[PDB]
Design a protein around this nucleic acid. Structure first.
Lengths: 92, 97, 84, 104, 105, 93, 78, 98
DNA sequence: ATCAATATCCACCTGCAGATTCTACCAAAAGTGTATTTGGAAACTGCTCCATCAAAAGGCATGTTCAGCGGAATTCCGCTGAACATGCCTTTTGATGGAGCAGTTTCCAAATACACTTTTGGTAGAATCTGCAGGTGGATATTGAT
DNA sequence: ATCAATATCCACCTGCAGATTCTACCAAAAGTGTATTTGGAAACTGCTCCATCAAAAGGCATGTTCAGCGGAATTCCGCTGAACATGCCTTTTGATGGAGCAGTTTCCAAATACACTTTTGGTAGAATCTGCAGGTGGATATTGAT
């Protein structure tokens, strides 16, 4: 059978930041666990947000507010940036 | 004139307070503080009487629950007088910093 | 309006004593009261930040008790009693 | 693909698939998988950068857990976002209480 | 017609509970037993606490349960205290408790 | 509307302690309690289901759920009451 | 078995913890805790195990446990 | 004959161990302890070695972080030697107990 | 300050576990194109409850005096943990049957989906009802002076 | 050990708000009953990967010695608690104007439902590869006795 994983995307993002840096196996795993974690967390709060508001759709709106709620100050900042940025690029 | 030794009243006060449930912080003043702090974030905001209340029940609940941990720290230091460092060890351990 | 100011002093020394009692505390240092107000301010800051966010996501201007409740639950300080 | 349209290295398609398949809500905006993709990738580089450093500043060119631990516990923000998380094989930051130092 | 609740021998509404299970997506589908069992646990847990509270009130010569009572019933019970070890009951106060060393001699 | 569990509590209330009443606040607090507990078991259930590539939540998950969330005797009794209620319902149509 | 968790071992841990002096009583205390820890965790994993109708506990079962114990752990599964 | 004063080697062990990541408890002895605690919830079980490692990585970690809040408690009491009372005190505040 | 027994470094070396590059493989995604559907934003507004102002009032905050006793500091001992050399019990390393973890086909019990029928429980709110808060006198403590 | 100054405990008494008891209405509900779909238990089958036997490795148990840390005891300065006087401002009862929350009909931009089709990420068996951990040396700093 098969087992998905973010590993591949991680490596990609690696070399765009440290062109010449390798990453341990155990290390890659931790990076994956990390991703899934965060994923579940944002996805989670977003779920709640919608429910609270008797809404039935999770949208960038939710993902954002969510991110504000989940991430620390400065971190949250950029996070929203990259955020709205990918959605602008995508639409236009 | 007659007078109680230091320690006697304070105890009377724990037995008393640990026996009641009414809030301990002046109401109107608290509200203000909430309104100030909120305003640092937003502005032109309104509050359901009860939201303010919910906030008070929580704050006291947290502060009260805190002083206990604090009071423990002090004692662990062969003391009976809570000092800032007690409030701090508690939070350092609690995981609030 | 009225430039809401220094209200953190609305939390009187008396009040901070009453609370220490229910806390089962007999003797109190002179520095506690201020340290305490310091701790209180942060508590509200974190709870109101979150609370007001929910209020904003709902496109409302009035902060509902429910907001405070989700705000509370989010930080693991769940409160029963206000429509939770 | 939607990921290249969003100029992201992360799989928008997969993130989308996981959202709906994660019973989070009835429906799902098309921009949400993108946005979340965006923010997952973002945090991902942020760690890699510091941890990459960690490797350098250790005279190593291969990132191992230690480096990742050294990168999170040394950064005020990341550490708070993972204050409840444990990285396998990462040890701790070198730290010793002043009072425990040999009185001179 | 027999409400599933009576079919199940419960006071808590089985229909409400199965319903909520849906409009709150926890999973794609929901087996008919799911709500039954849940309303069951819910009913059990609440009975358990009302018992303890009812008594609390009795001890304080009170005949109507108030928050304090609920607080008392919970904090004095090792097992319900851990189940609500992070929950805060508004208006419940705290259990009388003074550390030893603090007492006079 | 804006439903509550008030009546259902009140019934059970009248069951255990026949001559005792409950203050509007105390009920507020019981309602919160109920909802809260509901939300967790469901949560635990939800995830448990996922972890096992299962798409349905059956009395089976709701059970494990309860064993994971509740402690000692409470769970032991809870499980009982729950299984009981099911079979009684299961054996009728 | 528990005694299998040796003094030198517990010594080392406290070292990483930054401890300089260690009371002899500290050992029988440590273990008791180490036991209480594992009980609460193993308990939940095994439950996750029974549920999957399995006779072997899988690292995921553990991770999941740790997770709900509020002790998330990276390196053994998303 | 040359001796090292009380605390000097210990102090350099603190140094040694905060540098490495190695698991500090002997595998087998641990593994053995796991299964046993486990055999009280179900029987004739099996463990992915990978699941024993998680569990060990996890407990060590916890303990270590516990020896930290404990060492602080000892110092709060103007000492340098950690005692049960210190472990107890931390765990009590941690809410891990009461 | 003076050696000298040791722990800690730095530079160079090489094998090898484990990260990496090669290429066919192909199910399962992910994307596209069509057709249908519906969530919830917009516009109108009925109406709840929030900010606000007036005003009388006494609970409770503020500020001071006065000294009880707690915290801090200093000293000092014996008793407990740290360092260490010593003998070996066992945890660690590596080879080989077999037990469960899964991959896959099967089919039916069960969970949709949907048109109807009816029992329920929020509730707007006029009437009726009742536990207990808060005032009050009085008998039983609990303290702190001698 | 007697004692007066005070707080405590308590069974009464009772006005008022908050809990209880309903006739009156129902839109949202929960139930009923085929019709239609399928999630996953059940059984058969490898093939991992895990429990176990067994051999050469290397960390723990043990005891003797004493350095130095914790706890006891003693001391005193002044911090912090109790009692008191003065009066500010929080609380309490009303009431008014109008922000903004919440309910309703409306209809279109974006989401869902296959159907089809091109594509990419996950083994995997095979090969090739390289960052770095162990490992020798000898340079030099730390520690500790004098």
């Amino acid at each position: 059978t098969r087992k998905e994983s973010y590993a591949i995307y991680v490596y990609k993002v690696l070399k765009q930041v440290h062109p010449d840096t390798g990453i341990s196996s155990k290390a890659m795993s931790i990076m994956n666990s990390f991703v899934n974690d965060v994923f579940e967390r944002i996805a989670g709060e977003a779920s709640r947000l919608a429910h609270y508001n008797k809404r039935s759709t999770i949208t960038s709106r939710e993902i954002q507010t969510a991110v504000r709620l989940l991430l620390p100050g400065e971190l949250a900042k950029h996070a929203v940036s990259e955020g709205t940025k990918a959605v602008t690029k995508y639409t236009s | 004139p007659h007078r109680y030794r230091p320690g006697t009243v304070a105890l009377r006060e724990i037995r008393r307070y640990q026996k009641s449930t009414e809030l301990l912080i002046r109401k109107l003043p608290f509200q203000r503080l909430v309104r100030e702090i909120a305003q640092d974030f937003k502005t032109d905001l309104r509050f359901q009487s009860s939201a303010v209340m919910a906030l008070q029940e929580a704050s006291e609940a947290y502060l009260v629950a805190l002083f206990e941990d604090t009071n423990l720290a002090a004692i662990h230091a062969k003391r009976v007088t809570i000092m800032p460092k007690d409030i701090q060890l508690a939070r350092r351990i609690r995981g609030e910093r | 309006r009225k430039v809401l100011r220094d209200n953190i002093q609305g939390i009187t020394k008396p009040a901070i004593r009453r609370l220490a009692r229910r806390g089962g505390v007999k003797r109190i240092s002179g520095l506690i009261y201020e340290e305490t107000r310091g701790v209180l301010k942060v508590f509200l800051e974190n709870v109101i930040r979150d609370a007001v966010t929910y209020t904003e996501h709902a496109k409302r201007k009035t902060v509902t008790a429910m907001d405070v409740v989700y705000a509370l639950k989010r930080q693991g300080r769940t409160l029963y009693g206000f429509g939770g | 693909t939607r990921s290249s349209r969003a100029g992201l290295q992360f799989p928008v398609g997969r993130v989308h698939r996981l959202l709906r398949k994660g019973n989070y809500a009835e429906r799902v905006g098309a921009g949400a998988p993108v946005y979340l993709a965006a923010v997952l990738e973002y945090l991902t580089a942020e760690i890699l950068e510091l941890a990459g450093n960690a490797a350098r500043d250790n005279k190593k060119t291969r990132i191992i857990p230690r480096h990742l631990q050294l990168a999170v516990r040394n950064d005020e923000e990341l550490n708070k976002l993972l204050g409840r998380v444990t990285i396998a094989q990462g040890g701790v930051l070198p730290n010793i209480q002043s009072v425990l130092l040999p009185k001179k």
